[PDB]
Design a protein around this ligand. Structure first.
Ligand SMILES: [Cl-]
Ligand SMILES: [Cl-]
Ligand SMILES: [Cl-]
Ligand SMILES: [Cl-]
Ligand SMILES: [Cl-]
Ligand SMILES: [Cl-]
Ligand SMILES: [Cl-]
Ligand SMILES: [Cl-]
Ligand SMILES: [Cl-]
Ligand SMILES: [Cl-]
Ligand SMILES: [Cl-]
Ligand SMILES: [Cl-]
Ligand SMILES: [Cl-]
Ligand SMILES: [Cl-]
Ligand SMILES: [Cl-]
Ligand SMILES: [Cl-]
Ligand SMILES: [Cl-]
Ligand SMILES: [Cl-]
Ligand SMILES: [Cl-]
Ligand SMILES: [Cl-]
Ligand SMILES: [Cl-]
Ligand SMILES: [Cl-]
Ligand SMILES: [Cl-]
Ligand SMILES: [Cl-]
Ligand SMILES: [Mg+2]
Ligand SMILES: [Mg+2]
Ligand SMILES: [Mg+2]
Ligand SMILES: [Mg+2]
Ligand SMILES: [Mg+2]
Ligand SMILES: [Mg+2]
Ligand SMILES: [Mg+2]
Ligand SMILES: [Mg+2]
Ligand SMILES: [Mg+2]
Ligand SMILES: [Mg+2]
Ligand SMILES: [Mg+2]
Ligand SMILES: [Mg+2]
Ligand SMILES: [Mg+2]
Ligand SMILES: [Mg+2]
Ligand SMILES: [Mg+2]
Ligand SMILES: [Mg+2]
Ligand SMILES: [Mg+2]
Ligand SMILES: [Mg+2]
Ligand SMILES: [Mg+2]
Ligand SMILES: [Mg+2]
Ligand SMILES: [Mg+2]
Ligand SMILES: [Mg+2]
Ligand SMILES: [Mg+2]
Ligand SMILES: [Mg+2]
Ligand SMILES: [Mg+2]
Ligand SMILES: [Mg+2]
Ligand SMILES: [Mg+2]
Ligand code: NA
Lengths: 175, 175, 175, 175
């Protein structure tokens, strides 16, 4: 075992690798949503940029898990990054609904990792997870839910004017 | 009696305590409206912030009545702060209608206190009331009425797009 | 249930509402202490301002619980804010003793909420509570205890000179 | 009658002259308190300066009544300025007690003038009185009462240490 390793269970090490992969998969999904909203026949560029930002933040989280793994003396083991579920994402409402579900999936994986860390009496891992994530993850879920509520109010999916307006007012003006 | 007391009738002292309580009750109502518009299934954050601001201003008025009471040599006597009338506030139009009524209630209480002060020949109290309030209170009533007119124009309660637009254009961009 | 809700037990949601109420009640108690020390026949204005500051901080904590409730998909349910225990607070020593007890009461309520969150395996709620509170709450208890020790050293309740001096040196110079 | 005169009753004009005189008399009393606390066998220089400031503010009020009289088309009629009641003022507590009474006397004269103005249906005079005075006068009475409370707490008249401390901490550090 690594000379640095202390109080780091093999099961936790493995779960950290799986979380790293899930973050990479979430990044890649959000990148697909960006590409979709950038299409000439979609053309909602602030929505696109929102998803791009999220893609970059999830890749940053993956990198933090890599660094954490090494700091504890575990070993990074990479797997394929699965392509997203869909090739096209319908409209702003459907994409936001898919994002909500993705964020909930990631949150559940973090909850599960925290439970594992707790059961293995690893307070360092618990602190790490409670110091990069739960706050940020609940805030992202909240924001997406707020957006879904507003998209429904705006008459999505049918009301194209409403969709247009969402892109101008709800998401930050981009690039 | 207090060594500072001069020309301060017991009835006025009591009415000042009741006004303090009413201001605290109004604050608390506006705080409830904030919380409602912050809900994920409401999600009108500029509207929420408008109500939050109003909540803070009414608490500041309560504090001014406390200070006034002591300056005159009366004694602050606190009562329970009753919870708001409603737990949920419907939509922007219903909330604004409720605010209009609340503001009118507060204004009537101020009018009544001014009449009492007049009848007790207390020009200091009259001046105090005419120097923190009537101007500001009539302006708040006017603004809420203007908003109600605009919400009706925008098709509330049915027109969700209209509601959405009100939050972007009528109330100051927030937090 | 709310579209955002995940891993948030009904009992926790309810306990968050009760904590919100307790914070509002603590705020209101401290506001009463301010008003008392501002009286012309008390007249310890730095002491008064200390309590005013504490009143504002407890209201800010209540607002944080409101926001938290919504972020998790729970529903804010407000109750009456009970008036303080006393209408008059004796002197600096008695007020500080009452504050000590109030702070301990609030701390116990936070401890109890943390135990509940732990039992419901809600690390997000535990982190929230451990990230706004325990540090600050133990520091406030310590400061009030330090003050009580100093008030006793200064000869309270009998030694008015000592009381006078406390207001000039122990609490920050105010307004 | 003066070409400017409108709605200005002779009785009000006369009462304005008497108020001018009372303000000059109050100024002169406070000047005597200054001189007393400046004595080598009294030697409380911050207390002295407090009274000096008050003397200057009351002379400024007298000048405002002069200007007001002319603005309304009345005629300034001066009388002797009576010397103060006492030649020596005992100690800080006795002087503050005398100031409290003086301030109350002035306030009562203002109240009486406001009642007269009201009875003569002179809103300009009422506004003038409510715009230079009641606020400031109640605040001065409050401050003096606060000081009396503190002087008693400090053990006046017997406790010279307490008196000494009051001059260092209660009144602004002077000249
Ligand atoms: Cl190990
Ligand atoms: Cl192991
Ligand atoms: Cl790390
Ligand atoms: Cl597809
Ligand atoms: Cl998913
Ligand atoms: Cl955004
Ligand atoms: Cl009275
Ligand atoms: Cl009375
Ligand atoms: Cl005031
Ligand atoms: Cl309701
Ligand atoms: Cl009402
Ligand atoms: Cl606004
Ligand atoms: Cl849940
Ligand atoms: Cl549940
Ligand atoms: Cl929060
Ligand atoms: Cl009591
Ligand atoms: Cl308690
Ligand atoms: Cl302090
Ligand atoms: Cl005339
Ligand atoms: Cl006349
Ligand atoms: Cl003038
Ligand atoms: Cl004499
Ligand atoms: Cl007098
Ligand atoms: Cl001073
Ligand atoms: Mg080795
Ligand atoms: Mg292994
Ligand atoms: Mg495949
Ligand atoms: Mg545990
Ligand atoms: Mg823990
Ligand atoms: Mg985030
Ligand atoms: Mg996220
Ligand atoms: Mg629809
Ligand atoms: Mg007394
Ligand atoms: Mg009474
Ligand atoms: Mg009830
Ligand atoms: Mg006025
Ligand atoms: Mg206002
Ligand atoms: Mg108002
Ligand atoms: Mg309509
Ligand atoms: Mg729903
Ligand atoms: Mg429940
Ligand atoms: Mg009760
Ligand atoms: Mg604190
Ligand atoms: Mg505290
Ligand atoms: Mg003792
Ligand atoms: Mg002429
Ligand atoms: Mg005449
Ligand atoms: Mg004589
Ligand atoms: Mg003054
Ligand atoms: Mg004065
Ligand atoms: Mg004594
Ligand atoms: Na007036």
């Amino acid at each position: 075992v690594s000379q640095v390793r202390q109080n780091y269970h093999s099961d936790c090490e493995a779960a950290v690798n799986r979380m790293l992969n899930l973050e990479l998969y979430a990044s890649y999904t959000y990148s697909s949503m960006y590409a979709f909203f950038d299409r000439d026949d979609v053309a909602l560029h602030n929505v696109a940029e929102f998803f791009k930002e999220h893609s970059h933040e999830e890749r940053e989280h993956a990198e933090k898990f890599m660094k954490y793994q090494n700091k504890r003396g575990g070993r990074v083991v990479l797997q394929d990054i699965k392509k997203p579920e869909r090739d096209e994402w319908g409209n702003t409402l459907e994409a936001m609904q898919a994002a909500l579900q993705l964020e909930k999936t990631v949150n559940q994986a973090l909850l599960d990792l925290h439970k594992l860390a707790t059961d293995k009496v690893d307070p360092h891992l618990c602190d790490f997870l409670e110091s990069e994530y739960p706050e940020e993850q609940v805030k992202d879920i909240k924001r997406i839910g707020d957006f879904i509520t507003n998209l429904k109010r705006l008459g999505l999916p049918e009301n194209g004017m409403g969709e247009y307006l969402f892109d101008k007012h709800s998401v930050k003006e981009s690039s």
